[PDB]
């Protein structure tokens, strides 16, 4: 399913958007501590990486609202290109970050919603995976 | 976290997106019929489809703001998308939002209309800043 279902899920991912970005950031840094190590070490560069993580979640919930994966093809691609060019973020790092966001988001949902939700995450991963 | 009022407006705009986007399109063509005439920027089926696509995505950005209780989704997704749209390369952009505003507001009582109207206005403002 319903337009109520989409809104139900979107309001969940909005309300808990900080719990998700936090969870997903810890999962990322436990799994890949070389990002948080001296070799996202700086507070300004770690802030941008967190800013960019929250942005991907926003983009997902939007696509969930719209029932549509076209925004990923439109503004998603623009932003992922702008990341590795200007900010030098590696493709494996972004792909893994979105896997961590996926996991954390889905933990709040039930199996009916999570099945409806999971492909939106996967679509961004697939749309990046072709590069590296 | 999300108010009961804003969930309901968000569900109402989402459930009637077709009608709203239909009504916003014909109001735009009524007021500016040159746009879908042989010369104009919405004549060709591609360009008219992209206008239809984008209009609907703006209505979902409004819905998303309502759920956020915040203009954050416009800050996060709106501004970046606006910039890129005009880079592709224009007062029709802003007038289509105004018809979308009035098409949307027409579904709502005065209490709900006053909660939603600012988000349209933020998007009209954000657009105006790309004037030559
Ligand atoms: C009618 C007054 C009308 C027209 C003709 C258009 C739009 C339009 N937009 C593009 C490209 C384009 N639009 C956006 C917006 C956008 N992307 C998102 O993901 C957001 C959810 C949404 C904002 C609400 C973007 C980012 C882009 C660039 C990428 C792309 O979609 O191609 C075009 C032509 C593009 C080209 O190929 O040159 C046109 C004609 N909107 C109207 O209201």
Facing residue for B68 by CB, picked from A3, A14, A78? A14
User: Alpha-carbon distance B101 to B113, whole Å?
Assistant: 10
The one-character DSSP state at B113 is: H
For Cα atoms B38, B42, B44, give the angle at the middle one, nearest 5 degrees. 60
- Asked whether the beta carbons of residue B77 and residue A59 sit closer than 8 angstroms, the reply is yes
What residue has token string 């990486």? A49
Q: CATH homologous superfamily of domain A1-132? A: Phycocyanins (1.10.490.20)
User: Alpha-carbon distance B118 to B15, whole Å?
Assistant: 21
Taking the CA atoms of chain B, what radius of gyration do you get in angstroms? 15
| Residue B114 C-alpha from the chain's centroid | 16
Residue nearest to atom 8 of ligand 1 (CA): B50
Q: Tell which phi-psi region holds residue A32, choosing left (phi > 0), alpha (psi between -120 and 50) or beta.
A: beta
- Asked whether the beta carbons of residue B60 and residue A65 sit closer than 8 angstroms, the reply is yes
Tokens, residue A38? 């001296």
User: Alpha-carbon distance A49 to A43, whole Å?
Assistant: 10
- Asked whether the beta carbons of residue B64 and residue A59 sit closer than 8 angstroms, the reply is no
Of ligand 1's listed atoms, the one at least distance from the Cα of B87 is 28
- Determine the residue of chain A that is closest to B15 in CA distance: A3
User: Alpha-carbon distance A63 to B60, whole Å?
Assistant: 9
Residues lining ligand 1, Cβ inside 6 A: A 71, 74-75, 78; B 41-42, 47, 50-51, 54-55, 57-58, 61, 81, 84-85, 88, 92-93, 96
- Residues in chain A with CB shorter than 8 Å from the CB of B7 are 7, 11
Phi, psi dihedral angles at A48 (to 5 degrees): -60, -45
User: Alpha-carbon distance B70 to B33, whole Å?
Assistant: 35
Residue nearest to atom 34 of ligand 1 (CA): B88
Q: Residue by residue, what is the 3-state secondary structure of A48-114?
A: HHHHHHHHHHHHHHHHHHHCCCHHHHHHHHHHHHHHHHHHCCCHHHHHHHHHHHHHHHHHHCCHHHH
- Residues in chain A with CB shorter than 8 Å from the CB of B72 are 58
Distance from CA of A5 to the nearest CA of B (A): 9
Q: Which residues contact A131 (CB under 8 A, 6 or more apart)?
A: A91
Alpha-carbon distance values, A49 to A10, A87, A129, A131, B68 (Å): 23, 9, 19, 20, 22
A79-110 burial: b if 16+ Cβ within 10 Å, else e: bbeebbeeeebeeebbbbbbbbbbebbbebbe
- Asked whether the beta carbons of residue A6 and residue B15 sit closer than 8 angstroms, the reply is no
User: Alpha-carbon distance B101 to B105, whole Å?
Assistant: 6
Question: Determined by which method?
Answer: X-ray
Q: 3-class DSSP state for residue A110?
A: coil
Distance from CA of A12 to the nearest CA of B (A): 9
At how many Å resolution was this determined? 2.5
User: Alpha-carbon distance A93 to A80, whole Å?
Assistant: 12
Where do the domains of chain A lie? 1-132
User: Alpha-carbon distance A37 to B7, whole Å?
Assistant: 42
């Amino acid at each position: 399913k319903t337009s109520e279902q989409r809104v139900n899920i979107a309001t969940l991912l909005t309300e808990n958007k900080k719990k998700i970005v936090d969870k997903a950031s810890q999962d990322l840094w436990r799994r890949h501590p070389d990002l948080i190590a001296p070799g996202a070490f700086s507070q300004r560069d770690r802030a941008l990486c967190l800013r960019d993580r929250g942005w991907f979640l926003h983009l997902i919930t939007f696509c969930l609202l719209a029932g549509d994966k076209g925004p990923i093809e439109s503004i998603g691609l623009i932003s992922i290109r702008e990341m590795y060019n200007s900010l030098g973020v590696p493709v494996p790092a972004m792909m893994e970050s979105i896997r961590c966001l996926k996991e954390a988001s889905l933990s709040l949902l039930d199996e009916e919603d999570a099945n409806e939700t999971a492909p939106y995450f996967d679509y961004i991963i697939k749309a990046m995976s072709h590069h590296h």
